[PDB]
Amino acid sequence: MPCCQVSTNINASDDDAKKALSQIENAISQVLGKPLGYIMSNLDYQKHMRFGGSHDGFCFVRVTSKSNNSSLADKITKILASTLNVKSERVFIEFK
Amino acid sequence: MPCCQVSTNINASDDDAKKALSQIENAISQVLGKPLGYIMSNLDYQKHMRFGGSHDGFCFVRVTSKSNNSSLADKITKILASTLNVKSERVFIEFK
Amino acid sequence: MPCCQVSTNINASDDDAKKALSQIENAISQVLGKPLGYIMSNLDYQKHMRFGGSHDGFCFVRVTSKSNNSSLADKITKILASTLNVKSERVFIEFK
């Protein structure tokens, strides 16, 4: 049931994607206690996506299923900045 | 208004996609009584999508617009297993 | 926070996409008063997407964040018909 979708205009290689998603899955499992075997995740390369009118690198993260989402947001932002080289200020996490 | 989106990590050929979607549209029209001319459908190939940490074939179906969704879920699962060769246990249908 | 996603089966060139999205962003900023710097937009080419069972050109627009959405819908429809050569009757705008 828990989902995490990372939409990005960064053309992540197949391995960059696995790096980001495995780390986010681990983060969700750790902070929220959800088993890895129930988690669905994806990195959706959207070459046209824009934020603020700019095509500069940007990630939009949707996490579906809560005081600790502050912590989870922090881990996710650090993960994407590392794996995809996105600016933290251009990582936006939405919880649903 | 009624939508059905099949997200999958299975690289369905153009015709496999039409096979799956025409059959799902027929199923929605039959079980829910919605005219085919109002239905929107799609198969979104998401090469990075993961379930349980695995890239093994998997489909996530979202149907938007209800005792019979049990029946509709059953028809959709059988359809995808046939057309895309996905394991029934790796077909997940969500209604909204 | 405000998002606009245009999903379409029309294989828009990179520039057609920028033409459509910059104009929609301007429309959202003007009608709804949202600053361009807060708006996220995207055009998602979905080659399998169907409406009414047909693969004829079609756009599904989701705008997330209201008497004027009638006006905003009108501007968006005219924009896509111009930039992507879609029939107005095959442009569907959903607000959320």
Sort out which chain A residues have CB atoms less than 8 A from C41's CB and list them. 49-50
Whole-angstrom Cα distance, residue C30 to residue B77?
A: 45
Whole-angstrom Cα distance, residue C27 to residue C22?
A: 9
User: Using the beta-carbon criterion (under 8 Å), do C36 and A53 form an inter-chain contact?
Assistant: yes
The domain ranges of chain B are 3-95
Whole-number Cα distances in Å, A18 to A22, A42, B46: 6, 9, 13
Chain A touching partners, 3 or more CB pairs below 8 A:
B, C
Catalogue the E-assigned strands of chain C.
Answer: 3-8, 40-45, 50-51, 59-64, 91-95
Locate the chain B residue with the closest alpha carbon to C45: B44
Give the method used: X-ray
What strands lie across the sheet with C50-51, from one edge to the other? Answer: B91-95, B59-64, B3-8, B40-45, C50-51
Nearest CB neighbour to A41, from listed B47, B50, B92:
B50
Whole-angstrom Cα distance, residue C73 to residue C28?
A: 10
**What CATH number was assigned to the domain covering residues C3-95?**
3.30.429.10
Resolution of the PDB structure in angstroms: 1.8
Structure tokens, B1: 């208004």
Burial of B48 (0-12, 13-18, 19+ CB in 10 A): buried
**Sign of torsion over alpha carbons B6, B10, B12, B16:** negative
* B14-32 vs B69-84: helix crossing angle, rounded to 10: 160
Whole-angstrom Cα distance, residue C22 to residue B10?
A: 33
Structure tokens, C50: 């169907």
